[PDB]
C-alpha cells in the first residue's frame, strides 16, 4: 500500500533551528527541501506501522518567509508547507530493489542507536553512550553478520516478487524486538512487511507463523517445518533480547532517565493554539479546557514532534464570558495556562 506523507514545519524553540518533520509515508522515496537553503537531513527512520519519518533542519525568523517543499509518489503536487512507559528494543530491516538497497537501524525507546547501510557497509553508533561503552571489536562482528543478513534479505525479496508476480521497485521490511513493562513483565514481537503491509507475524506462545495472504502462506509452511528455528526465535525474544535491552539502559541511564519540562506558549489567529517546547521524556498530555472541562469538538492534536535536541514538542488547537485554558501534564505535574476569556 501507499501512504501519503504528513509534514509539519516548526522551530526548535519559540536564532533558531528550522525543523521540517515528514512522517507516516511510504514508499520511503522522498525529497525534502527547505526554502532554497541548505538543510541537513537526518537518517531514514522506521516506525512500528511500517511507515517512515524524517527530520530536516537548518532561522531567526524576522521580516522573512520560510517554507518546506516535499516530493512524494502519492502527491501530484510537490507540497510545500509554509511555516505560519514500557522500555523497549526494536530492530528494523529495510530491503530495496533500487536510497540504499539495505538499511538496518536499532531503536531503544524510539531512540536511534545502531545504523547499517548497504552502500558503505559498517555498523556505527547513533548514540554517544554506544560508542563509549561498546568495544570497537563489537561493531566488528555486526558489520559481518549484517552483510549476511543483507544478502539474505535480497534473496527473500527476489523470491517474493517472483512469488507475487511483479518486478521493479518493491520494499521488504522486518521488525524484531522485545519490550519490558513497568511492572516487570515482558513480551516480544517479530514481523515482516511487503510494500508497507503486514506480511508475516510470529507468535511465540504457539510457536507458529501467521500468514495474512495466500502467498505469505507458502513461506509459512516453509518456516514452520523448521521447528527448531522457531524454538531458537523464542529464546532470543524471551531471553537474549531482554538482556540486550537491560544492557543498553545501564549504558544510556543518563539520557533516558533525564526529565525536562515543557515551556507552554499560547496563541490565536477563531482558532487557539497551544505549543509545548523542549520536553522529555516524550510522554505528555495536552488538551484545551473550557470552564473547566476538556474540549472535544473542533480540536486538533499535532502528535509528538522531535525538537532536535533529543527533546520534543507538541500542540493542541481549538476553534472558538467563558475561559479557555491549556492543560499540560509532563511529570504529572498538571500544568494549566489560561489563554483567553
Amino acid at each position: 500500500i501507499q501512504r501519503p506523507p504528513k509534514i509539519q514545519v516548526y522551530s526548535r524553540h519559540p536564532p533558531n533551528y528550522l525543523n521540517c518533520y515528514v512522517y507516516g509515508f511510504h514508499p520511503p522515496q522522498i525529497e525534502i527541501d527547505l526554502l532554497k537553503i541548505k538543510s541537513e537531513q537526518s537518517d531514514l527512520s522506521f516506525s512500528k506501522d511500517w511507515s517512515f519519518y524524517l527530520l530536516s533542519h537548518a532561522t531567526p525568523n524576522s521580516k522573512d518567509q520560510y517554507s518546506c517543499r516535499v516530493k512524494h509518489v502519492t502527491l501530484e503536487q510537490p507540497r510545500i508547507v509554509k511555516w505560519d512507559r514500557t522500555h523497549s528494543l526494536r530492530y528494523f530491516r529495510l530491503g530495496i530493489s533500487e536510497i540504499p538497497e539495505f538499511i538496518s537501524a536499532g531503536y531503544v525507546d524510539s531512540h536511534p542507536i545502531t545504523m547499517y547501510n548497504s552502500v558503505s557497509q559498517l555498523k556505527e553508533p547513533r548514540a554517544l553512550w554506544m560508542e563509549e561503552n561498546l568495544a570497537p571489536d563489537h561493531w566488528e562482528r555486526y558489520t559481518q553478520l549484517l552483510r549476511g543478513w543483507q544478502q539474505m534479505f535480497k534473496v527473500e525479496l527476489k523470491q517474493l516478487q517472483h512469488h507475487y508476480n511483479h518486478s521493479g521497485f518493491h520494499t521488504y521490511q522486518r521488525m524484531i524486538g522485545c519490550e519490558l513493562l513497568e511492572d516487570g513483565s515482558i513480551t516480544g514481537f517479530l514481523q515482516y512487511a511487503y510494500d508497507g503491509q503486514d506480511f508475516l507475524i510470529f507468535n511465540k506462545d504457539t510457536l507458529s507463523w501467521m500468514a495474512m495472504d495466500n502467498v505469505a502462506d507458502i513461506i509459512r509452511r516453509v518456516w514452520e517445518a523448521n521447528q527448531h528455528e522457531l524454538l531458537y526465535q523464542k529464546n532470543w525474544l524471551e531471553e537474549e533480547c531482554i538482556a540486550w535491552l537491560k544492557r543498553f539502559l545501564e549504558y544510556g541511564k543518563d539520557a533516558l532517565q533525564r526529565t525536562e519540562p515543557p515551556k507552554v506558549r499560547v496563541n490565536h489567529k477563531t482558532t487557539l493554539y497551544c505549543r509545548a517546547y523542549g520536553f522529555y521524556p516524550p510522554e505528555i498530555s495536552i488538551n484545551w479546557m473550557k470552564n473547566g472541562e476538556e474540549i472535544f469538538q473542533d480540536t486538533d492534536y499535532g502528535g509528538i514532534l522531535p525538537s532536535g535536541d533529543g527533546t520534543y514538542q507538541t500542540w493542541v488547537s481549538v476553534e472558538l464570558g467563558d475561559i479557555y485554558s491549556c492543560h499540560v501534564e509532563h511529570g504529572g505535574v498538571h500544568m494549566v495556562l489560561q489563554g483567553f476569556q
Partner: antibody
Amino acid sequence: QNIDQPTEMTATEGAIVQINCTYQTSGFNGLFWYQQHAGEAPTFLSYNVLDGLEEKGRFSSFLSRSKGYSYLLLKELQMKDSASYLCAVKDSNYQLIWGAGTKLIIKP
Amino acid sequence: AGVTQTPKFQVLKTGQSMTLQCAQDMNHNSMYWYRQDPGMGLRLIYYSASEGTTDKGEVPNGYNVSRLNKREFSLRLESAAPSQTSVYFCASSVWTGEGSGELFFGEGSRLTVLE
C-alpha cells in the same frame, strides 16, 4: 568464554552412557552436539534451545539454560558409536564456541 | 552434494607457500575454515559470512583466505610454520546464524610442517 566436557569415557556395548557438558558464556543461542568419528569430519547430532529433552533415534540430548548444563544420552550402545562427541554453544554474538570433544570408547 | 576439501594430506618444509581448496555443492552462503588440534576444540581461523566479505577468526595469525566463487573457499598460508601442523577443516552453513544452522564439515586436511 568457557565450555567443558569429559575427555574420555568407557562403556561396554549395549549399555547406556551420558556425556555431560557445562558451559559459561556471555549469551546463549542454541547448543550443539556433533559426532566425530575417529579420523573423520564431525557430523551434526542434535541442537537444543529451550529447556527440555530432545530425543532423536537412540540418541537423546537435554538442556538446562539456568544451570548452563547439557548432557548427551546414548541408549543401546553399538560399536559404531565410539567417537569424539563435540559440544559447542553459540555466543551472545553468533560465533560458535567449541568444547574439546568427549572420546567414547565402546567395549565389545 | 557434500563439501569437497583438498588436499587430504600435506607435507611442507618451513617457509613453503601452499593453498587448501574447499568446495561446497549445497548452495550455502556461509563458509568456514577450522584448525583442530589434540586436547583442544575446533578453532576458527577465518570466515566468509557471505560472498565478498570475510573476517578474521579466533586465530587469524599465519593464515589468509579468499572467496573465489560463492561455492569455493580457499585457505592459504604463504609461509609454513611448525606450529601450523594440524588437521584443517572446512565447513559450510546455509547462513551465518540463523542460530539453528548446523555446520557441514569437509573430509579434513592433514598437514605436517617440518624443518
